[PDB]
Design a protein around this nucleic acid. Structure first.
Ligand code: MN
Ligand code: MN
Ligand code: MN
Ligand code: MN
Ligand code: MN
Ligand code: MN
Ligand code: MN
Ligand code: NA
Length: 327
DNA sequence: CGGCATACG
DNA sequence: CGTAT
DNA sequence: GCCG
């Protein structure tokens, strides 16, 4: 009834087991802070399974036969159903380790490895990092200066304003170039942590060298608070606000039109959906998938795709629109 | 037991 | 090392 | 942590 891969099942943005999935995702996050990518994946997959169910889980027996639910995840759900709370989850929530690793890793420019080292050095707060800025990278300094704004949800209202701005700069850098909204907002989210745009041009090859020209024009407009030949740009935009402005994370990506379907698919997510899709492609179909193409290692050939529908078909999967990829 | 997605900056 | 979905 |  429930397939084992998230790419084999529709997962809507809103669902009927929110509390249960949120608890499992706490344990997944904590596993990541401890370097256990395997446990993170299992908890993430178990959480996604509940997101895909057609109704709320009310009894433990309803977990029988569901993929990725073993002793541990079942016990988590058991306690939530019996007591409305799971002791392990609550112990994680209030642990100093979890709170600090979450605070640090959410800084733009700080990963698990950096946060862990800082935690081992005794650092605990953002001000602890601001006291010794000589140890920070320019990227981390930007993420720390703008941390407050970057922790505020981006609204879909903000997205429309940014896209018009980006299209203006793209139109001058290369007439005919297009801008496509991707990421969580393409999946239907009403809020997000950043805005993701995919840029291409209908004439293969014309997109070459495009991103530097876009960035130069955005910077000349005074809209870039931070940015690093290249095809991905992780920036911080100055977004006008009522009588002021706020910093917003924006990702700009360029792909040739031949690769656009694969880049659209990859950058539309979700992260778990794409991991599962690539795992499915390799393990079940023997094909190698990334945001550039789909490769048959036997014939040593790349699949030509004109649309996302093409890609799902070449993997033998039923098509899922972006709104059903919220794994 | 091995595997766990796959890139770019 | 960071970043992305 | 779970699947195959
Ligand atoms: Mn256990
Ligand atoms: Mn009990
Ligand atoms: Mn995003
Ligand atoms: Mn992004
Ligand atoms: Mn490339
Ligand atoms: Mn093992
Ligand atoms: Mn993300
Ligand atoms: Na970070």
């Amino acid at each position: 009834w429930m397939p084992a891969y998230a790419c084999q099942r529709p997962t809507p943005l809103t669902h009927h087991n929110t509390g249960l999935s949120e608890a499992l995702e706490i344990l997944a996050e904590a596993a990541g802070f401890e370097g256990s990518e395997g446990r993170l994946l299992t908890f993430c997959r178990a959480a996604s399974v509940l997101k895909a169910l057609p109704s709320p889980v009310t009894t433990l027996s309803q977990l029988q036969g569901l993929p990725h639910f073993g002793e541990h995840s079942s016990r988590v759900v058991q306690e939530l159903l019996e007591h409305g709370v799971c002791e392990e989850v609550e112990r994680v929530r209030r642990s100093e380790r979890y709170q600090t690793m979450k605070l640090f890793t959410q800084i733009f420019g700080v990963g698990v490895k950096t946060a862990d080292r800082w935690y081992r050095e005794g650092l605990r707060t953002l001000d602890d990092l601001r006291e010794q800025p000589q140890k920070l990278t320019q990227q981390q300094k930007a993420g720390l200066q703008h941390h407050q704004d970057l922790s505020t949800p981006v609204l879909r209202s903000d997205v429309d304003a940014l896209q018009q701005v980006v299209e203006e700069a793209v139109g001058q850098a290369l007439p005919g170039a297009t801008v496509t909204l991707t990421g969580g907002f393409r999946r239907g989210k009403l809020q997000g942590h950043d805005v993701d745009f995919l840029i291409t041009h209908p004439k293969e090859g014309q997109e070459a060298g495009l991103l530097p020209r876009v960035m130069c024009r955005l910077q000349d407009q005074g809209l870039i608070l931070y940015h690093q030949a290249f095809e991905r740009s992780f920036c911080i935009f100055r977004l006008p606000q009522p009588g002021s402005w706020k910093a917003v994370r924006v990702d700009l990506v360029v792909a040739p039109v031949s690769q656009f379907p694969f880049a659209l698919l990859g950058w539309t997510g979700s992260k778990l959906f794409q991991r599962e899709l690539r795992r499915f492609s390799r393990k079940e179909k023997g094909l190698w998938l990334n945001s550039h193409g789909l490769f048959d290692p036997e014939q040593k050939t790349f699949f030509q795709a004109a649309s996302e529908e093409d890609i799902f078909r070449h993997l033998g999967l039923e098509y899922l629109p972006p709104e059903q990829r919220n794994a």
